[PDB]
Design a protein around this ligand. Structure first.
Ligand SMILES: CCCCCCCCCCCCCCCC(=O)O
Ligand SMILES: CCCCCCCCCCCCCCCC(=O)O
Ligand SMILES: Clc1nc(Br)nc2nc[nH]c12
Ligand SMILES: Clc1nc(Br)nc2nc[nH]c12
Lengths: 346, 346
């Protein structure tokens, strides 16, 4: 149905910029929105200032958004649960604080929307996969797309995809997350794996985009990096058993192109400094997502025997002090080739 | 073979920014490069100033690039011929001045590289199709990709695709156009139709990107326009009998994303003014490619029964004084839907 669903309550676990922006979206579709944040002192400040001064400065929270540090109070009564907890803290959160939450979700069959992105170092698994160790996969969906947080939080027109193996789950979440003024529009897809892969890999590729800028390259180069980089997302998705339908959509190409063009993002600045010859040690002052992700990504790639040329070279630049110009030359030493895309039509 | 081909002479018919930049690329692979330009007086100026002050100001031409107004002197001895003549002048050029050129090309089996982009109003055909009425299609290839002219002309890293129905033709052109310093890298593909469609449609979509900016929208919106717009290139390509393998490559997505992000381009400024409420008459002072293209594109789409939502609405805004906010609302009145991309992997 193209008819929107409104709820009494939503909970968002994760208080970053993205989680906060999504809570702003939900505030227009649910009467009450709770945002869980572990530090009580900081919870008080935020509720006082009516603004997430910690991670979304300059944005006034809707009056119906309340921050809390009490997990139980947070989810009680919620009819949709969002996870935006950083990958590295996800598992521990469920083990240490998810017992009742999990029981509640299972009992009430509450939809869960995974918004966290990355790769867990110990298992090489993606966020929805980790969460799926604790919550029934039939209840799980993934949100991904070109969605700069400030724009989303302020209601500037944004499109994203919602992925669920069962398209009917995604379609229902589409009705909850899409806004009445059409400022936040969701598109349904089955490709959960493609979404998670794109969401992690885009951060590594963004460092490369930075490198290209630091090397003195221009916008033609950035476009080429996006397009060739996209095939790496595609190939890794295939190897992971994903259907790949999100690769050339909002979650894949859409988000990748946006993320690689964010010149002020930390991924980009780190790549630019690396491209200018600065060693990673000097740069490291606040870890760029791409830095953290590059290592587990290479390990997963190696484990699955997937060649990811750009990502591999970016990993070398970041972790093995490889000179950026040497990496580029190595990349361009493969000789002349065909583009590597199959025909769509026969 | 990954081994480059060097030539004695190249000719480029068309003296615009792009043709001039491509002549700079060729100057590094051919001893002599002739650029044909119809106005003799302007030819003299350019050769004197050793700079295309007309369409590529600020760039010093290689000493081996010579401008000329003599078609016969231009192609004589050439071993590759590039066309960059504007769509609307292509047919007349062959009819009025191509007799001997055509005989020479046929006799010597000279490769022809089509770089012109657009749709001819009278026949609704694309540039390589028009040229193919005069030169044997086996000799024809198309060059397309994210390739801002200034960057190409100055040797800043650029990747493009070369398309030919027979992949072997494209592969040979790849050896001629790719540079020894790897600053200009070509990728082979069969999808000529996809390239021509993308190259024309991107200009219409760029006006829409402008409109979005003028409406107060942001980068999330631009990313969505690129991604949804790409499906229109895909569907039109299918209807035209193209194989579509270029759609998600450099010629399609790559060039589209670049072109839609060029905020200072005429397509973009025209869209932005339209988005700000200015009527097209007041704007029209130097036609933006997207304006010229929108009409023949809609006619071709209608003729083939292909729905192109964004392009259609852009045509309405440009040609039928439709209010941009009304167009947007109409576009968003389709209800909630699936993303519309097939799985890549089963
Ligand atoms: C970490 C290195 C980043 C440098 C970025 C270079 C700018 C874009 C390069 C795109 C060319 C793609 C090379 C493909 C070669 C291959 O498939 O092995
Ligand atoms: C000429 C209008 C341009 C306005 C541009 C709006 C910004 C991007 C909009 C993308 C949403 C895509 C709408 C798809 C709806 C449909 O498929 O009918
Ligand atoms: Cl230990 C820990 N857990 C969660 Br959940 N989130 C965090 N953010 C910082 N440290 C964190
Ligand atoms: Cl009439 C004509 N022919 C060619 Br070819 N190119 C042109 N450029 C402007 N007018 C032109």
């Amino acid at each position: 149905k193209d008819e929107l669903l409104y709820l009494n309550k939503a909970v968002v676990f994760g208080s970053g910029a993205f989680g906060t922006a999504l809570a702003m979206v939900l505030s227009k579709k649910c009467r009450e929105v709770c945002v869980w944040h572990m530090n009580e002192e900081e919870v008080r400040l935020v509720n006082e200032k009516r603004e997430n001064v910690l991670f979304l400065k300059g944005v006034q929270l809707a009056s119906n958004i309340t921050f809390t540090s009490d997990v139980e109070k947070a989810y009680n009564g919620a009819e949709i649960i969002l996870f935006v907890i950083p990958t590295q803290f996800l598992r521990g959160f469920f083990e240490k604080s998810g017992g009742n939450l999990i029981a509640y979700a299972k009992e009430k069959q509450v939809p869960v929307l995974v918004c966290t992105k990355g790769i867990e170092r110990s298992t090489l698994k993606f966020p929805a996969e980790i969460i799926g160790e604790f919550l029934p996969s039939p209840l799980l969906s993934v949100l991904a797309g070109p969605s700069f947080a400030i724009e989303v939080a302020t209601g500037v027109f944004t499109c994203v995809s919602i992925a669920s193996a069962d398209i009917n789950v995604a379609r229902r979440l589409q009705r909850i997350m899409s806004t009445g003024d059409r400022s936040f529009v969701c598109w349904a897809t089955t490709d959960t794996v493609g979404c998670e892969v794109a969401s992690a890999v885009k951060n590594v590729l963004a460092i490369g985009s930075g490198v290209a800028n630091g090397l003195g390259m221009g916008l033609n180069a950035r476009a080429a990096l996006i397009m060739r980089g996209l095939l790496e997302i595609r190939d890794l998705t295939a190897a992971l058993g994903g259907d790949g339908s999100a690769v050339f959509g909002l979650a894949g190409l859409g988000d990748l192109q946006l993320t690689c063009s964010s010149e002020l993002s930390r991924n980009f600045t780190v790549g630019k400094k690396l491209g200018k010859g600065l060693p990673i040690e000097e740069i490291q002052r606040a870890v760029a997502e791409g830095v953290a992700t590059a290592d587990p990504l290479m390990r997963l790639a190696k484990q699955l025997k997937v060649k990811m040329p750009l990502c591999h070279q970016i990993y070398e630049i970041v972790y093995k002090k490889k000179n950026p110009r040497d990496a580029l030359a190595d990349l361009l030493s493969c000789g002349l080739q065909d583009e590597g895309l199959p025909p769509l039509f026969k």
